[PDB]
Amino acid sequence: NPYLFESQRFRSRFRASHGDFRILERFNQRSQLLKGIEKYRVAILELEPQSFVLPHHCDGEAIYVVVKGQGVINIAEQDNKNSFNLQKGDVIRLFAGSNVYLLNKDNNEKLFVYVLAKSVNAPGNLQEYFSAGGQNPESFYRAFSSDILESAFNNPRDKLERLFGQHKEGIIIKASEEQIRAISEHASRSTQGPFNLMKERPVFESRFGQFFEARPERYEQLRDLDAAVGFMNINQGGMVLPYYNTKSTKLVMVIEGNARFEMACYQKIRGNLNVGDVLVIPAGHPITFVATGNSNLRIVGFGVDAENNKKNFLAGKQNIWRNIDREAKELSFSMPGREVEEIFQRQDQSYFVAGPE
Numbered sequence: 001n002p003y004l005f006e007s008q009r010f011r012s013r014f015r016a017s018h019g020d021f022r023i024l025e026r027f028n029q030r031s032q033l034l035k036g037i038e039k040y041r042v043a044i045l046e047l048e049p050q051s052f053v054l055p056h057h058c059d060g061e062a063i064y065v066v067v068k069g070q071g072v073i074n075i076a077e078q079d080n081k082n083s084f085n086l087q088k089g090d091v092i093r094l095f096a097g098s099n100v101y102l103l104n105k106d107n108n109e110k111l112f113v114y115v116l117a118k119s120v121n122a123p124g125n126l127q128e129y130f131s132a133g134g135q136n137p138e139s140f141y142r143a144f145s146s147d148i149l150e151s152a153f154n155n156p157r158d159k160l161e162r163l164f165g166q167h168k169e170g171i172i173i174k175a176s177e178e179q180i181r182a183i184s185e186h187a188s189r190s191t192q193g194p195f196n197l198m199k200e201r202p203v204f205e206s207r208f209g210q211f212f213e214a215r216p217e218r219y220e221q222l223r224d225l226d227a228a229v230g231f232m233n234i235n236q237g238g239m240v241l242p243y244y245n246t247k248s249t250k251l252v253m254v255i256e257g258n259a260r261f262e263m264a265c266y267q268k269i270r271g272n273l274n275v276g277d278v279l280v281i282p283a284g285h286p287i288t289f290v291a292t293g294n295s296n297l298r299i300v301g302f303g304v305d306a307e308n309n310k311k312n313f314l315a316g317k318q319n320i321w322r323n324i325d326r327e328a329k330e331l332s333f334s335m336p337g338r339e340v341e342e343i344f345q346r347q348d349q350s351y352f353v354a355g356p357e
């Protein structure tokens with residue numbers, strides 16, 4: 001499967017000492033049929049307890065989704081400052097060129113952030129510009145002549161030289177309570193910000209699973225990217241009835257449990273998905289997920305071209321076939337209509353059912 005990007009294809013970019021930040025492969029290079037998502041790049045940013053990513057800004061519109069833990073983020077713009085703290089499931093939209101720094105304010109729990117970002121300069125070409133740092137990573141402030149910086153900051157080429165250079169530790173370093181308590185107090189708000197993935201009722205739900213989806217049609221933050229952050233919660237031993245998306249290519253990744261998937265291309269692409277593995281579900285392709293293991297099945301994913309995207313189910317009480325009449329069913333499968341109608345209808349459940357034990 002060219003759609004299957006295992007967790008091992010996440011390329012850790014910078015020398016990150018405490019935790020690390022990993023960029024997944026370009027979707028188009030592995031097999032040039034994933035070119036609708038060629039401008040899109042997915043990443044996974046990982047923060048150990050009491051860590052801290054140096055303030056930077058990416059060229060490209062981003063979307064942070066918190067998968068594990070909690071922490072504090074700070075978005076800095078030319079004439080605007082905002083400090084939010086996030087829990088599990090919180091989605092927040094990062095705009096291009098905006099400066100950002102994170103921190104794991106938890107002393108035992110770890111910080112996992114599932115990240116989406118679309119290019120703006122060259123299709124897929126994504127770069128992080130670090131205003132902080134020293135030698136690791138370089139600070140773009142060291143790409144300017146000393147007399148330029150000396151004339152910009154009004155400072156001799158000594159204090160600036162010792163400032164932007166004297167810094168050894170990587171992107172993610174350790175923070176301390178005297179720093180955190182102040183940082184988290186800037187974040188402490190009263191009475192755009194983040195929104196949890198369960199801010200809504202499940203778009204679809206059964207006694208065996210739930211599906212939450214943040215949509216551009218509701219959340220303004222998502223209208224620019226035309227992206228939807230759906231979250232699919234399958235219960236132990238359960239499954240999603242085979243369905244397909246109308247126009248949205250999804251970039252889905254397992255965050256809890258082991259998922260067994262099958263999908264039509266019609267080549268039958270099958271596989272197993274562990275936590276951290278990425279699967280791409282292009283638009284129109286049917287697919288099903290099954291919880292395989294003692295654990296549950298929680299699995300999150302971004303969706304591009306999200307506006308007006310529906311889900312059409314191919315089985316269950318509410319599938320597309322009820323909206324196809326009897327005679328068309330006869331011509332379709334070359335059997336009596338009341339006979340195939342009694343095949344499609346003897347599943348009383350609609351979206352999530354019991355997977356094969």
Ligand SMILES: O=C(O)c1ccccc1O
Pocket residue numbers: 229230231232245250252281299300301302303
């Ligand atoms: O197929 C989807 O639309 C989807 C969206 C978000 C998470 C998991 C998913 O399968």
